[PDB]
Subunit: 495 residues, 3 copies
């Protein structure tokens, strides 16, 4: 008659965590921290739409391939989307010096303003209107890059050009020009007459002189000739000067770098959908609530940290339980307002009252460690897009190795921190449960008997008033010693 037990929570939970020791450990309370869902669309970053290059590449856009649309509104972009193998690029064949370096400069760039440095009508001494090619159809007629000029000899004359543009603005100016390589020596004279020509550029920082490389090459896009382009960034209060005796592909428009910041070149074959997100990946956007995802490693914006894992679940409550009176036997399904409590078993009581003095402190120590574990990975490696050419393979590998190299690490760190601190959590409950036992045992000494299954039976008589006192740490041995003494010896000489 008249007992009491120490026991813990257990409920209809079935979500399971893992540890270093065990796997698939059913628990009462746990939080998933891994996002692994994405919407599959291409969306804007917090109101700021991407530059969707469509079937075009970066070169075609900036050179003005007649198939690539230009951006007359000077839009701001959050990023730039370019298909994997873009169909509209160098419509007239050739090369594009330091293209990769220049794609990299887009990444810290958010807005352009196209300005006209050298208008087409200002080529008085040459034939500007004839440089076009079958390689470059607009409406199926032969045309050409809309931002450069294919200068051609006038009346069979090519006056040596010398022309300059002073950069009179505050922004950095992006300037592109090129040179033409003809098939045979006859085609050179056919177009520029001067048998030996050159194309010279001069700024405060970059000085070069390009000579035409005449060779026989396979017909690419119908053309056996090649045209290679150059670029440079003209500083404020500087001035560029071209001069050539022939083969000069001239600029008409320059690009004004008006907004530098956080951007990138995403390669995705998606097109835009009326849609916004805080995190974007080439395959879809992301619900940036959970601190970890495994969707794509190139994610941009306010994103959770990418790890290579199938699952990542924390452990917050105890592991689940029927398990009768006593913690030695398992969980009590009956408790609801706490993680640890007791069972009354009074002359006039039933049981089930939680110890809020230690549940609240435990709800405070785990949940305060849960967000704190998240904050331990803020400085986690985030990968960045980059591009390299067929003669840069070594540093392409190195980049991959480095980035793959950090991902493999932080995946391991994150897994380990979950696995370890999960076992540290469960071992807390076991220690907390077994500790609540002592708070009682230490305080009810001879007045009761340790049944062993984690319960106590009183040689004294408790009552509801007494049984709200050692829960609170106020029960007095001296107040109940004499009756406990007497009933104790009653069995010492009982039956």
């Amino acid at each position: 008659g008249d007992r009491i037990c120490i026991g813990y929570h257990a409920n209809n939970s079935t979500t399971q965590v893992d540890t270093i020791m065990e796997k698939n450990v059913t628990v009462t309370h746990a939080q998933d921290i891994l996002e692994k869902e994405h919407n599959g669309r291409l969306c804007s970053l917090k109101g700021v739409k991407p530059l969707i290059l469509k079937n075009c590449s970066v070169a075609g856009w900036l050179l003005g391939n007649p198939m690539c649309d230009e951006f007359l509104n000077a839009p701001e972009w959050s990023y730039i989307v370019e298909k994997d193998r873009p169909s509209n690029g160098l419509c007239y064949p050739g090369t594009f010096n330091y293209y990769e370096e220049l794609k990299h400069l887009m990444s810290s760039t958010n807005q352009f303003e196209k300005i006209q440095i050298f208008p087409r009508s200002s080529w008085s001494n040459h034939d500007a209107s004839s440089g076009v090619s079958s390689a470059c159809p607009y409406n199926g007629r032969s045309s050409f890059f809309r931002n450069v000029v294919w200068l051609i000899k006038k009346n069979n004359v090519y006056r040596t050009i010398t022309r300059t543009y002073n950069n009179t603005n505050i922004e950095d100016l992006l300037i592109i020009w090129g040179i033409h390589h003809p098939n045979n020596a006859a085609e050179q004279i056919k177009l520029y007459q001067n048998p030996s020509t050159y194309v010279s550029v001069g700024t405060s920082t970059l000085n070069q002189r390009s000579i035409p490389e005449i060779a026989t090459r396979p017909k690419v896009n119908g053309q056996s000739s090649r045209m290679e382009f150059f670029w440079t960034i003209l500083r404020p209060n500087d001035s560029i000067t071209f001069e050539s005796t022939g083969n000069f592909i001239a600029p008409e428009y320059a690009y004004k770098i008006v907004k530098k910041g956080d951007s990138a070149i995403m390669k995705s074959e998606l097109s835009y959908s009326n849609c916004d997100t805080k995190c974007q990946t080439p395959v879809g956007a992301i619900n940036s609530s959970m601190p970890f995802h495994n969707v794509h490693p190139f994610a941009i914006g306010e994103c959770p940290k990418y790890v290579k894992l199938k699952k990542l679940v924390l452990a917050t409550g105890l592991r689940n339980i029927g398990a009768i009176a006593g913690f030695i036997e398992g969980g009590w399904q009956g408790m609801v307002d706490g993680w640890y409590g007791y069972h009354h078993s009074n002359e006039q009581g039933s049981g089930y009252a939680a110890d809020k003095e230690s549940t609240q402190k435990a709800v405070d120590g785990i949940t305060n460690k849960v967000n704190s574990i998240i904050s331990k990975m803020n400085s986690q490696f985030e990968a960045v897009g980059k591009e390299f050419n067929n003669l840069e393979r070594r540093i392409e590998n190195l980049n991959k190795k480095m980035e793959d190299g950090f991902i493999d690490v932080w995946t391991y760190n994150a897994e380990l921190l979950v696995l370890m601190e999960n076992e540290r959590t469960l071992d807390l409950h076991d220690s907390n449960v077994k500790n609540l036992y002592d708070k009682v045992r230490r305080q009810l000494r001879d007045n009761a008997k340790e049944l062993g299954n984690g319960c106590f039976e009183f040689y004294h008589r408790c009552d509801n008033k007494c049984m709200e006192s050692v829960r609170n740490g106020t029960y007095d041995y001296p107040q109940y010693s004499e009756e406990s003494r007497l009933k104790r010896e009653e069995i010492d000489s009982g039956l």
Copy 2:
């Protein structure tokens, strides 16, 4: 009279582990996980032999240095071995553009088929048979690279060459050619007559034009002239076109990239031995049983993970013990079929019976954590060979820094995971031993006395039948209460 003790294993083990807290901790059972033995030979990877370049370098091989042997059988290789400072390389001096990029392309390459694009007899209008040099002895006569042609003027004439090869196969074609730089202007006319010449190459992707750079240079291998080479990969359904007015070193044979995959260029001064392995390092092969080694950081194949450590030992059993009856005193040398057990001490028994209910569960939880710790490092950084030229030092450092940088990490990770989970293991036994005590104590309450040294003495009388019941969790207090009650008070008023 009639006692019982809780105790653990201890045996003739002397292997010792370390932890964060202690070092050289003698234990009963532990597994070494570090390979640090290698056979010292150069061997094949799972049946697939390496390409052993011998005293030759990659250039000498592919150019066909008369001293380098060619590989007529089109062999497949698992890797390529090249001595550190190979003696047979550019026998005729000069340069070799993008050599490092090309060594890097070997690494994803497993088999070549040499094919003849431009036969030697098809140089009708020039003198192909005279281009040789003292720089290039075969059988001590003056010869030349066996895969290119040193074209020379015929009857003091050098018709401008224009020649093409359409790539009519599926494989990528590797093509090498070069140009000659003569000593003085007289030597140019001596060999090619045309005072100003050039060497032009055209494909869909690469277009260049090289002009001879006439200068005075020290006699290297007897030659003050230089010959520099170029290479490019000709895609299927493409076509390369050379044309030159002089100085043209021509291809005869092209290399067909027939097998791409996992390979590498190992630098080792070893030669092949009839021998096979799953893991190879430049100093010897490896017994790929243990998950970690410290042999060499450039290891290729099915290899264990390389860490920079002298030793790496897990801990699986308890730490070793004479230590008499009781776990407070130490290990029991007497137990063999378990890690935790008891000692009978019956009127008619002796002792030593293991608790298999908890040994098997412990043999299951450690060994299940042992292999699981191994699997936590599958995605561990593996270094990759790479090469750089005397003007690429910065990215050479960066590569080293990065690779050294990851090794230092994963070494630390691995050490820490051992050190930590080793202490977690030992603390398990201590917790397991002390827990077996309670399973008993909780179940034999007043029927016995806690001696303190971890043993119990019965006020009741047990017997062999009773003493196979609380081991199993079936002993009944009520069944033995009255006798225990009576003998209990016998001493309460005894002597």
Copy 3:
């Protein structure tokens, strides 16, 4: 009457650590491991002073800009200090090939010896004394780079130069030369007459031929022309040969690489102060006592490891406490010569005696784990200075990403090792305190009563002689059983 308690230390300590679970945990004993103070000066590394380039850059120094001071004493340096935007660099405009690669070669370099290869008087056939410019004032007169020669035509003649230097020494020789690009074709004839010229260099390893690139460029430092420079390292027993028909900027002095080793190029706008240190950062030197700092990530010398953290404190003693008799109640302010002890409470004693058997072992296990945690980070990533040009941005990023990438890791590792092993420490004391209790409890069985608050009261009578015996593990139950038996039943039938 006549009691005894188990309790621990507590003192006037207020330094607080953090863990994974808790923050700001007041403890008795802890060690700071983070340096975050620096002296703000630029100092020498262990007796070896830096090369302070002052307002000059590396180019100006080695070319001998008339404003840059030369180093006639052939000094050894521990490092090189160069302001961020150095004012004295290429005083005459132009370019400097592979400058970054060459700055990188300084980093493994500690001492130069300037030697004169080609004296100025030995330019018999040309005008060496006239090459100067307004771009290069010394004492406000027009001058020029003090280590190269601006060769100019004599009597309107420019004999084709052919000149060689055999490297007759053991050191590697560093050699710099350049070429001149004039404004207009008239300026070429004005200075060198030969309309088409070239500048050719030949060694065993490097062969090139530079042609002047005539173009119109903005007046930089008053000059619209440009002069670009080249460098190469001449091996022992080798020989370099220049020859030119014009535009040749010639070497007079070469640099002898006499000491290679650990050095670097620090960018700091500090100047030297009579001052020495073992660790230097661009903002100040460092007290290299603590194993971690957060001052600057480019630190050179015998330095502690840099982490990105505000604070990093270990935990060595227990957490601080008034807390009366008993460990259940808290710390005893009274103990001084130990971490764990007791309280006598004798008929003739007071209390407070430490258990040195377990304090010394604990002072040994923590302090032996404290230095050992430090040693777990010896192979920690240290960043290295490096430089890149406006067309190398991609690998600049990669370098940053990699280095930032490792710092973020090892910061996390170090934080985690503190946080975790701090909780492992505190949990040791709790386990140690509770273990000292059992050493007593296990040994004083029925002779006393467990009061619950962590104290014992003797049914026996102890005394000072008896109360130095279970502290030492020598107290005998049988020696004191009969009196304890008798006084035990005295209360069993007492009041």
